[PDB]
C-alpha cells in the first residue's frame, strides 16, 4: 500500500503548521492514501484544545522570550517546541473509534524506529492523563520522557501526532510550562534530526506496512489550511479563548 510522505513545515509560523494538520485530517476521505507528515516549529508553546492558556503557561515570560502561543485541535496538555523537536503526524482511514489501539499502534512504530537508532524506549504505562511523564501517549527512554503525542478520531479517519525531543532546550521547556524527567534523543545516541526522521520513515513503513513516497499537499488541503489559519488559527479568540 502506498502512502504520502509530506515534508511540509512552516517553523516560522506554528499557527499555520497546526492549520496544516487540521486541514489534512479534515479533508481526508476514507480510502485515501495514509499520510505521514514531518515538521518542526520554532520556539512555541502549543496548548491542547480544552486548555486555559494562563493556567498552563507563563504568558508574560513567553512574550519576553519571543515564544509563540498556539492552540491545536487535539486534546492533551501543553508542550514547548523549538527547532530541536521533530514533529510528525499520521492521518489514516479508520474503521472504529478505538483510540487506545491507535496510540498503541503508533507507539509500536515509534519504538521500532528508535531501535533502528540504537535507542531503547517504550510507551508509558499509566492511565493518568494529567501527569507529566509515563502516560500511554508518551514514549519513555527508561525513566525519561523523549516524546509526547495526541490524537483525534472521527467517522472514516484518525489523526495521531507526536513531538520527539531530539535536541530541544529542556530548560526553556520547563520554564515555559507553569525538567528532571524529560530527555533528548541525543542524550542517548549521537544522531541528527534527519537521521531520526529517516529512522521513523523506515519504522512506520515497516510497522504499518505502507510504502510512504514523497508527496506534497493538494490545492484542496492547502486552501482549507489557509482558510483555517485565516479564520481560526491566526486569531486571539482561538488561541487565547477570548470571546468578544
User: Hunting for cell 492549520 — which residue is that?
Assistant: 19
149 is in an annotated binding site: yes
138 is in an annotated binding site: yes
User: 27 near 156, Cβ under 8 Å?
Assistant: no
Residue 183 is part of a domain; what is its CATH number? 3.30.930.10
User: Hunting for cell 515509534 — which residue is that?
Assistant: 110
34 is in an annotated binding site: no
Q: How far apart are CA 145 and CA 76, in angstroms?
A: 15
Note the maximum CA span of the chain. 52
152 is in an annotated binding site: no
Domain holding 138, by residue range, is: 1-244
Q: How far apart are CA 110 and CA 195, in angstroms?
A: 14
Method used to obtain the model: X-ray
Number of H helices, E strands in the chain: 8, 11
72 is in an annotated binding site: yes
Cell of 213: 513516497
Q: How far apart are CA 37 and CA 9, in angstroms?
A: 9
115 is in an annotated binding site: no
**Rg for the chain (alpha carbons), in Å?**
17
100 is in an annotated binding site: no
| Of the candidates 36, 156, 140, the residue with the CA atom closest to the CA atom of residue 95 | 156
Q: How far apart are CA 72 and CA 79, in angstroms?
A: 11
Angle subtended at Cα 26 by Cα 17 and Cα 206, rounded to the nearest 5 degrees: 75
163 is in an annotated binding site: yes
DSSP string over the chain: -EEEEE----TT-HHHHHHHHHHHHHH--TTSPPEEEEE--SSEEEE-TT--HHHHB-HHHHHHTTPEEEE-SS-S--EEE-TTEEEEEEEEEESS--HHHHHHHHHHHHHHHHHHHT---EE--B--TTSSSSBTTSEEETTEEEEEEEEEEETEEEEEEEEEESS--HHHHHHHB--TTB--GGGTS---HHHHHHHHHHHHHHHHT-EEEEE---HHHHHHHHHHIIIIIT-HHHHH----
Can you name the residues that pair with 46 across neighbouring β-strands? Answer: 70, 79
| Of the candidates 145, 191, 149, the residue with the CA atom closest to the CA atom of residue 166 | 191
Q: How far apart are CA 143 and CA 152, in angstroms?
A: 27
**What is the stated resolution of the deposited model, in angstroms?**
2.1
| Of the candidates 172, 163, 167, 212, the residue with the CA atom closest to the CA atom of residue 188 | 167
220 is in an annotated binding site: no
Number of domains in the chain: 1
Cell of 142: 527508561
Amino acid at each position: 500500500m502506498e502512502g504520502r510522505l509530506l515534508l511540509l513545515e512552516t517553523p516560522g509560523n506554528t499557527r499555520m503548521s497546526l492549520a496544516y494538520d487540521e486541514a489534512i485530517y479534515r479533508s481526508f476521505q476514507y480510502g485515501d492514501k495514509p499520510i505521514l507528515r514531518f515538521y518542526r516549529h520554532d520556539r512555541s508553546v502549543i496548548i491542547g484544545y480544552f486548555q486555559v492558556a494562563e493556567e498552563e503557561v507563563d504568558l508574560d515570560y513567553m512574550k519576553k522570550n519571543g515564544i509563540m502561543l498556539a492552540r491545536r485541535y487535539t486534546g492533551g496538555g501543553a508542550v514547548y517546541h523549538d527547532l530541536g523537536d521533530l514533529n510528525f503526524s499520521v492521518v489514516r482511514s479508520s474503521d472504529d473509534m478505538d483510540i487506545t489501539s491507535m496510540f498503541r499502534t503508533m507507539n509500536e512504530a515509534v519504538v521500532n524506529s528508535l531501535r533502528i537508532l540504537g535507542l531503547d524506549a517504550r510507551p508509558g504505562e499509566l492511565n493518568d492523563v494529567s501527569i507529566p511523564v509515563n502516560k500511554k501517549t508518551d514514549i519513555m527512554a527508561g525513566e525519561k520522557k523523549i516524546m509526547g503525542a495526541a490524537g483525534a478520531m472521527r467517522k472514516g479517519a484518525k489523526l495521531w501526532h507526536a513531538a520527539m525531543l531530539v535536541h530541544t532546550d529542556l530548560d526553556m521547556l520547563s520554564a515555559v510550562l507553569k525538567r528532571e524527567r524529560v530527555a533528548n534523543v541525543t542524550d542517548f545516541v549521537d544522531v541528527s534530526i534527519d537521521e531520526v526522521r529517516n529512522a521513523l520513515i523506515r519504522g512506520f513503513s515497516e510497522t504499518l506496512h505502507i510504502d510512504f513516497r514523497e508527496d506534497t499537499i493538494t490545492e484542496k488541503e492547502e486552501s482549507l489550511a489557509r482558510e483555517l489559519f485565516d479564520k481560526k488559527y491566526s486569531t486571539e479568540e482561538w488561541n487565547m479563548g477570548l470571546l468578544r
